Each structure stands twice: as C-alpha cells, then as structure tokens.
Amino acid sequence: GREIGLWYAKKQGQKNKEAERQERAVVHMDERREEQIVQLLHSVQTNEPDATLDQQLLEDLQKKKTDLRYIEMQRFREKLPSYGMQKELVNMIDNHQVTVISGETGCGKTTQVTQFILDNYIERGKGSACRIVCTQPRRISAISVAERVAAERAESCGNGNSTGYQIRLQSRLPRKQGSILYCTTGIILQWLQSDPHLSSVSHIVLDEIHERNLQSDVLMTVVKDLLSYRPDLKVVLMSATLNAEKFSEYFGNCPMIHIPGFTFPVVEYLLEDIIEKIRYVPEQKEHRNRQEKEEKEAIYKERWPGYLRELRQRYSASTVDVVEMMDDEKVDLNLIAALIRYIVLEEEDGAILVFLPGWDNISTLHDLLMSQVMFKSDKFIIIPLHSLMPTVNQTQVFKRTPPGVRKIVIATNIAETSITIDDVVYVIDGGKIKETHFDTQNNISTMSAEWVSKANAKQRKGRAGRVQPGHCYHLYNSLRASLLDDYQLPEILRTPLEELCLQIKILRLGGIAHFLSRLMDPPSNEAVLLSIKHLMELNALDKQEELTPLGVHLARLPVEPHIGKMILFGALFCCLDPVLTIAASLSFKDPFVIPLGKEKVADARRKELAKDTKSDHLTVVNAFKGWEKAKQRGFRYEKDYCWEYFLSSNTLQMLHNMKGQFAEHLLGAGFVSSRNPQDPESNINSDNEKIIKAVICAGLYPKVAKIRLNLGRKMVKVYTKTDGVVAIHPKSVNVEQTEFNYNWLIYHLKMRTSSIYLYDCTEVSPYCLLFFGGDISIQKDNDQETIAVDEWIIFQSPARIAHLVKELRKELDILLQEKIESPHPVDWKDTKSRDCAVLSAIIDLIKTQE
RNA sequence: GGGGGGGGGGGGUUGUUUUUUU
C-alpha cells in the first residue's frame, strides 16, 4: 500500500538531501589575490493678473468667433449634452471650491468643462488669471483629449496656444496664463516636490476618478489636505455616475452635478437569453481567497436552487439544462462560437467584439473560429486584440469594412478602455477579467480570473451602441449579474506601497502612516508596516522613518526602490548602459511581442537572443543592442529586425527615452559626470556580463532562488526561501535549460497564477551574493568549511579566505555608504578605489565555473 | 519515490490583465 511508497519516498528524499551537501560551489581565490587583499586590508584599515493680456485674450476671442472652422466646430459641439449645462456648470464651479461632475458615455465632460471655465473667465475680462490643469489616467487619453480640445478651439496643440498637454518625456506646453494643460496624474505629483502649493494653478480637474488608480488617489488626498492652504484654488472631480456620491462625501459633501449621456439604445441579453435564442446544444458530454469572496460565493449557493425554478416557467427546458451543466472558473468558448455563427448567419451587418480574460482563451477561440470552413474565407476578418501582440493588428482594427464582410475582434480589457473601435455593433462579454491581489502575509502577488465588475460590465455594454443601435450579450446568468461587485478593488489595496511610501516621504507630507490613513479606502496596517520594514531593510529609511541619503535618491528616481538601487550601483560601477536598459525593461514592459499562432517561434527566437548568458535580463540588452545596430543600416533593416525577433519598436523607443531620463537624473544628483548613457567614462565595465550580473544582484538581492539539478531526463527544480518550490515561466529563456554553471537565480517578478512562477530569471555567481547580499557568516558543518550569506546561501571556502571576504565586504559597505552620502565619480588612480577595484577584479577573473 | 508489481488510482499534473513618473 501507501506504506511502501512512503518508505521509498523518504529514503529518496534523504538521498537527494544528502546530495545537497555535495554540490555547493567552491569559493576560491589564488594565493596572489589573497596576498593583495591582505595588503589592501592592512593599509586601508589604518501668472499674476496682467490686464493687457486679458484684454488681448478677449479681443482674440471676439475676433476669432467669426472664423469658419470655429463655427463648424461649435455646430458639432452643440450636439453634446454638456453644452446644455454650461451656465449651470460654470456657476456651480465658481460658487464652490470643490464640485463633483458625473457623466455617462458621450457626455463629453472631459473636453467641455475645462473649455467652459476658460471661455467664461476670458470673456469676463479676467482671462489672465486662469490656469486649468486636467489630469488623465492614460498618456494616449491625455494626448487625444488635448488635440480634440485644440481642434474644437481652432488652434494647434501647445505651441503657445491655449490648450496643451504634458506626459512623460513628451510635452507641448500651452500659454503661461489662460491655458488648459492635459497632463497625466503623475506629472502633478512631481510638481509638488518643488511647488507643494501649486501656486500658479487656479483650477485643477481630476478626470476618470471612478476607476481608482494609485496616482489619482494620492493626488486627491494631497488636494484635499492642501485646500486649507489655498483658499482660491478650485477643484473639479469627474466620475461615471456610479458611486459618484462617495467622492462628494470624501470632500465634505461638496455639490454634485450630473450630465446625461447620449448613447444609442443597446439591447442586453444574458446567458439564458442566448441559449434560448441560438438553440445551443453542448457538444462535449464529459461534464464530470477570503473575505467578501466567501459571501458572494455563498449567497450564490444559498439561492442557487431558488433562482433555478424561475427559469422552468418562462423559458424552455433545454435552457435550464444548459444553465445547470454550465460551470464557472472557465469561459465556454463553444457557446461563443455558436453565438458568433448565429450572428453571422441571421443578424444584420456589424462588427463583433468579444471580451476574454486571457491570451489562452483568445488563442483557443481563434483556433475554434478558423477551424470551421466558413471563417477561413475572405468574407470574415478575425483580429485578436492583446497588449502583447504586434501593433500591426492594432492599426488594422479601426479600418471600416465592406458591408458584405464581417469583422470579429477577440480582445482582453484593452479594447474596453484603451482601444476605441467606434464601429462595433455586437458585443459578447465573457464575464471574466484577470485581477491581481498582493498577499501581504506571503509577500506574493497573485493573478486569477475573477468575475467582471458592474462598472466594467457597464463600460463593455457602452462600448457598443456608439454609431448605431447595438447588442450586448453577457455570458453570466441573472443571478450572477445581480450578485456582482459594484466596482473593482482599487490598486491601493492590491499593490505594494514601497514606491508610494518613498514618494510620501519626498513630498514632506508628514508621517507615512498618517497620510496613508487619510486616504479614502485606506490600506491595511499590515501592508504599511511591511512596506516600512522593507524600506528600512533596504536602508532607504533610518530607524525614525526619515529619508536616508540613499532614500533621497531612491525617492527622486521614477522607478521602484530596488530598480533605483540597481541604477545607482550601475552608475557607481561604471556599467551604466546595460543597467539602464535592464532597469527600463523592468519598470515598463519587455520589447518582445508575440503574434497569434507563431508563439513557439517567438520562444525560439528569444532563446537565440539570450546566447549563453542564461539570463532573461541580458537578452533584453542583446535585443536593444541589435535594435540600435539596425538603425545605422536604415529603416528597412529596423523593420526587418523587429519583425524577425518579434520586437516592439515603440517599446524600444520608450525604453531609450527612459534611459536618457535616468542618465539626466544621475547627472543632476552628481553620480556621473555626463548626460549621455553611452559616455565611455561611465561605461568602463559595460562589456563585462559578470559585472552587470553583480549589479543586478546588488539591486534586487532578497529575490534569490536555488536550483537543484536532479536526475530521472535531467529536470531542474527551483526553490525559494519563502515561497517554497516555484517554477520558471515558459516565457523565460531558462525554462528548458539544464547546463547551469551556478545554482542560484536572481529574479524581479514573481507571481502566482496557478503555480508560483518566476517570469524573469538570471543565473548569478557566488561572489555577487557575497559582496552584494546579506550578512556573512563563517561556520563549519561537520567536515566542510563554509561561508554563508543570509544563513541559507552557503558556499564552500577555507576559514582564511572566508574571513578575508567578510572583512572586504564590510569595507565595501562602508565605502558604498560614503559614496552614496557624497556622490562623486570614482577616479581609478590608486587613491581609495582599490576597494572597488579588487572586487571588480575578483568578479571578473576569479570565478570560472563550478 | 521508481518504471519492485499491476496492491490501489497513497504520490506522480499547471504559460503571458491593464496601466503610470517637472
């Protein structure tokens, strides 16, 4: 029975356990290096209100009222519902400090309210004292709104005109006074560093606050606690008419206004309606978290019988049978295929937009669709929409189609907010959306496919019915629809707060706990304590929650604190360019994209790009180097390279701009003596992959994994100190790699979807962990003489070598604190750079293999 | 635990939501 198997398994595990203490690396330096270290240790140890401007603005407004383009634009704008409330909106804003505006889809509140305020100020003779700033949650949204408003005003965007925008690394600044600026929310937070009061800003508008991102909440709290200091500033908040009362309550019951929307009628169908209408018969016959989740999940199964008999009277028996056999935790793509076939058979012309949770669902639905004979012809176009697919499909989705053909788009929630087709008539909404929750207890981030929210369902329904009446099919029964969450949980309760805590400390917003508690929907105390503990362990904050000199640079850097530490270390060790590229990739996406079908080829090309570095961080460096090399040969070679390795040119350009920004910040802080990341003086060690790996280890140290090379096949098992047994994601370049020189990996992203996965990994060498890791100890197990880092990263070494390494590590810690405290480029002429030079030499030369 | 048996089927399994920073 199980006894024999358990007895065999215990012995096998013991044999594997006994084999662990036979496979440790042998940290070993030669006699000459040890003598040099001994000598070095022994030696070293011993605005305003201008009237003429307002007059000119009024004269321009009067003279330009007769322009033909402006007349046409106002004829277009007249159709907007928000024009009917212009007098009410202006009076409400002018008579109260804070107002809340609720508008449905098509109300145009984004492009009209700011124009209303600016024009009203201009024609009253005080147009030189208006400075309106409207915040947007997306860069493309800000750009589009800015250009739309500028066109409505018959003026060019920016260029000294009234309207403009400013996003990261792109800005078209408008006039100093009497202007509208459509920036992202993150721009305003950067303003508070040097202008805490926003003295030049008279009106500030917070847009799309119904969806609760971190930056919007932080800015809202800052504005709330700043109003007492500025009695003349006016605040406008825009919501989506759902739970718009809570924002008014948060601001002391400020007046609230509502703009009716203007959308074509949309017919809504549920699962039972689809089953009854399309007569869907299942083909396969093989049908055989905490807190709020438990409740909803429970009431569902406390009424499940009671709800069911209500379908046995109005509807048919087949519908009830199919509903009964229906199962959650998945999206029935057979039902989607049957519904699509029904629509293409006897429904009128119109694009179909299907909302799916993940990429696997998109792939299997696309395969199911094109497996049939009818969809493989030229009378149907199927476009999958996903942020990881090449832009050639994003630019091919807006084009109108001939009336004979039909366009079917299978999309994630990107098409719900970012992509606006403005052509879809039929919408099929699988009620699944992927959400991420941060488990502070296990310090882990988890993804799962949860039921879509009420606001998300309303937005999906409103996606159709833009240019003509449309249909919305919902893949969940009425009981699920009525038992659905009103809003998605804000990311303030779903993300780590380390960067947020550093930003709070850099804005002089008082204590971290106090400011976080003053937030609406405040985070739990456990998350705040964990963030502060991580920051103090990182040595970014001292004991008394104050900004350590390293913490100042970390906070002023627009990245995560670990990424900022990596950037500082790269600037200090003169490997600036690869470290900056890796940091940009870690902060904002990887340049690799994947097209549908050709997915294995993508992984083959990715492994080709990684050469033999056994790391997915250096493959990004290789891809960036190849992309830069292709430019010097021409644009055609650039396109060919991006099409060969499945890269994203836009992402690569963005990464280049982020690298330039980091270099500019480092020059400002004084770490480097140049602004170009490619300056050789700051890129002495840029060609050494070992130094780059050491700097990566220095940046994200505590994220370390252990490899145990077993034998049957020669599989690899990866262990983590806190997460237990984990796995390497198939997207990684080390998922099928077995020739590992060292048994330690470094990772940045670790997420739990079905099993704990390390999305990016990098094989790292013992001296990197020795000189850039935790505490060092020198013990002796039985016979073996060992040196260990953090009591679990153990290496083999004699006592003398280990003690010299420990003393060298202490000396480098002191030197690093000195260098960070008073930044200055390191001069490599035998003065005090010997401490860093010897570790560079050790990492370069001493380590060869295991 | 293995491919010591077919004494059981007690253990052998699992790919990428969307965004943001003078």
Curated annotation (Swiss-Prot):
Activity regulation information from UniProt: ATPase activity is enhanced in the presence of homomeric poly(U) RNAs, but not by double-stranded DNA (dsDNA), double-stranded RNA (dsRNA) and tRNA.
Listed cofactors: Mg(2+)
DSM (DHX36-specific motif): region residues: 1-17
Region named RecA-like domain 1: 47-259
Motif (DEAH box): 207-210
GO cellular component: axon; chromosome, telomeric region; cytoplasm; cytoplasmic stress granule; cytosol; dendrite; mitochondrion; nuclear speck
Principal EC category: hydrolase
Gene Ontology BP term (one): positive regulation of myeloid dendritic cell cytokine production
Necessary for interaction with single-stranded DNA at the 3'-end of the G4-DNA structure: annotated span: 138-190, 359-418, 499-558, 710-719, 729-759
Domain Helicase ATP-binding: 90-260
Gene assigned in the entry: DHX36
Outcome, altering K15G: Decreases G4-DNA-binding
Ranges where the Helicase C-terminal domain occurs: 338-508
Chain spans, region Required for G4-DNA- and G4-RNA-binding: 1-46
Modified residues (Phosphoserine): S822
Subunit structure: Found in a multi-helicase-TICAM1 complex at least composed of DHX36, DDX1, DDX21 and TICAM1; this complex exists in resting cells with or without dsRNA poly(I:C) ligand stimulation. Interacts (via C-terminus) with TICAM1 (via TIR domain). Interacts (via C-terminus) with DDX21; this interaction serves as bridges to TICAM1. Interacts with TERT; this interaction is dependent on the ability of DHX36 to bind to the G-quadruplex RNA (G4-RNA) structure present in the telomerase RNA template component (TERC).
Protein name: ATP-dependent DNA/RNA helicase DHX36
Residues with the N6-acetyllysine modification: K806
